Amino acid sequence: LAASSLFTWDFDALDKSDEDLTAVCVRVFQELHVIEQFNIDEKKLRKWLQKVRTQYNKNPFHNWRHAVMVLHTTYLLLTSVATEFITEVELLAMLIAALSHDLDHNGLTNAFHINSRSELALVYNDQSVLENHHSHLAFEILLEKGCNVVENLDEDEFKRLRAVIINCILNTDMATHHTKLSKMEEVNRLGGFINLAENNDQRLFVLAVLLHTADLHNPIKPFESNKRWSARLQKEFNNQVELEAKMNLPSLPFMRGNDEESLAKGEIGFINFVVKPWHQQLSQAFPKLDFLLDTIDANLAEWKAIAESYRQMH
């Protein structure tokens, strides 16, 4: 399949088999030339892709297909916006970070770990509990001898690659969303990003911004994809509500809704207060991405129509 046919904005891993998903991940490494750049052993790349997939759990949303969605979307974002400042090391780092960013997720939020006083919350002092666990596991898999995709990087390259993987995964925590939004507003106020290839700190910030954008792939896909994934996330929220009840823990109110009306109500709130203001800042810094505002508006209108037919049939 041609690259411009596989690498489009309508891709959804939901409709693919495990065999095809492994193939899609390989193609992403092929097209970005990171294999020949760092002499990646394809036996270790295939073993790493296998251990990452099996290290994901079978949740409705936070599963291996979500990780492939994030990688594929990250491929599109970097290809469209970052090809003229991202380094070869950072490009490989973003591939490992996208695929590993939700390793061992169990469908439970950080708040669950903090409220339940879980082992993970104790180890990580309630700070970005899930994301710290994902990143830690990412290197435990990556640094097994038979999976060392980055075995040929020298000392300084691996230090940069590791710092990029850590920072990007940690910044998928929604608790740092508004931190990155405020920095993004300040960047757009003085004209946008300049000399990104000279500024390793701000370029790393851009990468974190892009991985976070790719993580929120539901409102920027066709509405059929948006609906299926959002409903799978809603199932995780309702599942956590049930578990929190059995444990006699407090539950957040928006996780209790379990029908189509409350699903549309919630996604309209998520788009209007998280995704759309985010992509309005992203589009200013990167005008090549403002076509996603049209996808977000299209899905928003489609969600508003559903919530309208429920207002009517009172």
Catalytic residues: 62
131 is in an annotated binding site: yes
Shorter beta-carbon distance to Zn ion: residue 173 or 215:
215
Q: How far is the CB of 109 from Zn ion (least distance, A)?
A: 12
Shorter beta-carbon distance to Mg ion: residue 172 or 226:
172
Residues with Cβ within 8 Å of residue 33, at least 6 apart in sequence: none
178 is in an annotated binding site: no
CB 67, CB 100: distance < 8 Å: yes
Shorter beta-carbon distance to Mg ion: residue 8 or 127:
127
Shorter beta-carbon distance to Zn ion: residue 211 or 307:
211
CB 235, CB 243: distance < 8 Å: no
CB 292, CB 226: distance < 8 Å: no
66 is in an annotated binding site: yes
Which of Mg ion, Zn ion, none does residue 230 bind to, with CB < 5 to 8 Å depending on kind? none
Is 102 an interacting residue with respect to Mg ion (CB under 5 A)? Answer: yes
Q: What angle do CA 177, 214, 81 make, to 5 degrees?
A: 105
Gap between the Cα atoms of 162 and 97, Å rounded: 9
Least Cα distance to 48 among 71, 31, 32 occurs for 71
CB atoms closer than 10 angstroms to residue 118 = 16
CB atoms closer than 10 angstroms to residue 207 = 26
Gap between the Cα atoms of 55 and 72, Å rounded: 19
Q: How far is the CB of 215 from Mg ion (least distance, A)?
A: 7
Q: How far is the CB of 31 from Zn ion (least distance, A)?
A: 22
Pick the stretch among 3-11, 15-23, 85-93, 169-177 that binds Mg ion (CB under 5 A). 169-177
CB 99, CB 70: distance < 8 Å: yes
- Where on the chain is the footprint of Zn ion (CB under 5 A)? 102, 215
Shorter beta-carbon distance to Zn ion: residue 46 or 228:
228
Q: How far is the CB of 18 from Zn ion (least distance, A)?
A: 19
Gap between the Cα atoms of 109 and 1, Å rounded: 38
Is 236 an interacting residue with respect to Mg ion (CB under 5 A)? Answer: no
Which of Zn ion, Mg ion, none does residue 236 bind to, with CB < 5 to 8 Å depending on kind? none
Pick the stretch among 151-159, 165-173, 267-275, 298-306 that binds Mg ion (CB under 5 A). 165-173
- Phi, psi (rounded to 5 degrees) for 224: -60, -40
105 is in an annotated binding site: no
33 is in an annotated binding site: no
Residues making up the binding site for Zn(2+) = 66, 101-102, 215
Residues making up the binding site for Mg(2+) = 102, 131
